[PDB]
Symmetry: D2
Subunit: 220 residues, 4 copies
């Protein structure tokens, strides 16, 4: 297909957090069938950010998920046209993020047009206080509805001094052109880590590994 | 810097269930009368693949009549201005996240609005364009951490009669730290569509709003 | 069915973060005046390991003053009675789920209240007993499917000042189908603790409540 | 050697009582069963004793009818097994995609090899044309709960779903907080429990139901 074993990534993010505007540019490269990708980000406006980097990490494309042959790959099949996703993240202390990405492809490069709004984060929370230290690995549960895919994750940031900061993530993925088939109820396991950052997190390199699977007790 | 009649300039950039759209608008208000009227034009992504009315509240509580005994945090944020950030959770799973950065140059307010609407079901009143307007509302407001938090249990009216409920939280942030803060109080709002074209590409709407204490409030 | 002064007999069974408790009380009210007083005694699992105030609203909107132009769904449910079911989502993740089945025998209302309080954090104002009361409230109510839905953006006051916010939804179900429903409207309520002992084992509380349309109706 | 050491046996019995309301409708259910705590399996048979035939689909009740019956590898601390003989309580919310909300608690105690469940159920705000009231639910998908320790208690969250008649799913976000009655000595870390619950038998009107659960604890696959 148009999905190659190695593909490039060009990212743009415009965001507001507790009313503070910022922009981030990035570029990267991934291995869609291997389920891996690495991106490098640079804050281009509104930096250094007045909140912890890590809530941004999942915003910086589940086309980079390894799919076994018996799970239809809705997102890879959305190309060349592409797809959009829309995400809410409700945090245990009332913080809420609402994020969208419009993903396009030109040549062998994905283009991400990301819009981020973070709101109602308390001033003494781990995000504003920059106390988040990364994400645990996660397992997203996905199911088809109305020709789109809905994924929900019970996820958590790790916090300095040990401990977790829990979040409920919902993502809806919409192929720009009608899918001809849909996967069933399934999961994606993901692990995202920061490889590199400057002290101020103005420049960050991060890596994601992701694999789709059925539940271990699944039956067709 | 707040005058008896002021101008409104606005831009909304938005996404609804992945569909990108832009709206611009202009109008005028009477900040102390608690009234304002805006006219909006869809400039990009029209005609909208959803009912108009969810956008109405997005198109400045500086246009609220305040009595002398309720401190006016938002009017008092100017010249510097304020930002607001709002979530709207609808009874059917639909969610909107909206922001506005309000500035003032001359006697004209500028709204830089960003709208995200997500997870709206295809057969709900929004996508099916079955919303017919808003009920009037009552927002409960309280101070916290030098900012203002307001919550509404609102509802849109729907064609065949009946309501489509929503829970709205707005956080209002002055750009310069406030000297004083208001207490626990309420804003009554009534928003109406004065006119629109068939396809809702141009809409005229009017807002009347008044701040008050609870009827059983004791100083 | 409804008289100018009516008695209240109530029982509450509940758990809060796993801790079982029971409360019994009684009182009286003036359904048309929109007032009622109740006196409660913790009969089981006291002193409660959490602040009293989250329970206050659980201890009958038949005691709301309705003007001539707002159909009184809840008074008109009697003699058969009604049930309500309520959720309270607090800003720190605490959640209460409460039901009440209200019946009428003679002059006296009987409340059978079931309370579950879950996920309240240890350092929050409820567990720490830092709640000092409720603000007055405004419930928005609308009819659907022959039942009444009410929502409140409420708040408890907290020691030292400031508030602890809660979102309350109540669904009120008449036991016999209603041949008349009210429209979109509001109830204004004020609830006060009138007296308590040091450990809140015995509490008296008063409630005034009035229904109305929005001011710009 | 002491009595407390062998409180979890290879085979345990279950005796349960559930009292609940659904959209104001009162009902009671009793049940008995047995399980194999170390194998991660149990089976229970329920009978509706009051307020039946229920005016809603059975399946929302299934997870209410004890994660002591979860297979744990040696490297995941078994908080719930170790809460015994004292036992533990759990408290759960289930927020459904159409606004329906269930709040459920269970106080679990143990005598001999029999667990006793005292279950309290509240189901509210379920729409009249939703799949629960319409009895359109047909069972649960298998699930994966994410668990983490907090303040000496265990918190688990599931993004779960009921299957419904036409094909399709009815999604739910489940939170459970598990509280040992006696303060734990050690806590597990961030981990998962995979569960599959199925109906094994039922009568027409679901007045009597046999259901079976298998559950296994594990770390994330990439762990
Ligand atoms: Na809410
Ligand atoms: Na949730």
């Amino acid at each position: 297909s148009v999905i190659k074993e190695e593909m490039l990534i060009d990212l743009h993010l415009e965001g507001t957090f507790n009313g503070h505007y910022f922009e981030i540019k990035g570029k990267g490269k991934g291995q869609p069938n291997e389920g891996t990708n690495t991106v490098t980000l640079e804050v281009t406006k509104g930096g250094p950010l007045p909140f912890g980097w890590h809530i941004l990490c999942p915003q910086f494309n589940k086309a980079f998920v390894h799919h076994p042959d018996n799970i239809h790959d809705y997102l890879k099949l959305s190309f060349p046209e592409g797809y959009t996703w829309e995400r809410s993240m409700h945090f245990e202390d009332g913080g809420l993020c609402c994020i969208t990405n419009d993903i396009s492809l030109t040549g062998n490069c994905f283009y991400y047009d990301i819009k981020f709004t973070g709101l109602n984060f308390p001033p003494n929370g781990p995000v504003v206080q920059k106390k988040t230290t990364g994400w645990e690995p996660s397992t997203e549960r996905l199911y088809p509805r109305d020709g789109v895919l809905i994924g929900d994750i019970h996820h958590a940031l790790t916090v300095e001094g040990g401990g977790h900061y829990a979040c409920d993530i919902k993502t809806v993925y919409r192929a720009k052109k009608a899918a001809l088939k849909m996967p069933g109820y399934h999961y994606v396991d993901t692990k995202l880590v920061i490889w590199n950052n400057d002290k101020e997190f103005m420049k960050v390199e991060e890596h994601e590994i992701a694999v789709a699977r059925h539940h271990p007790f699944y039956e067709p």
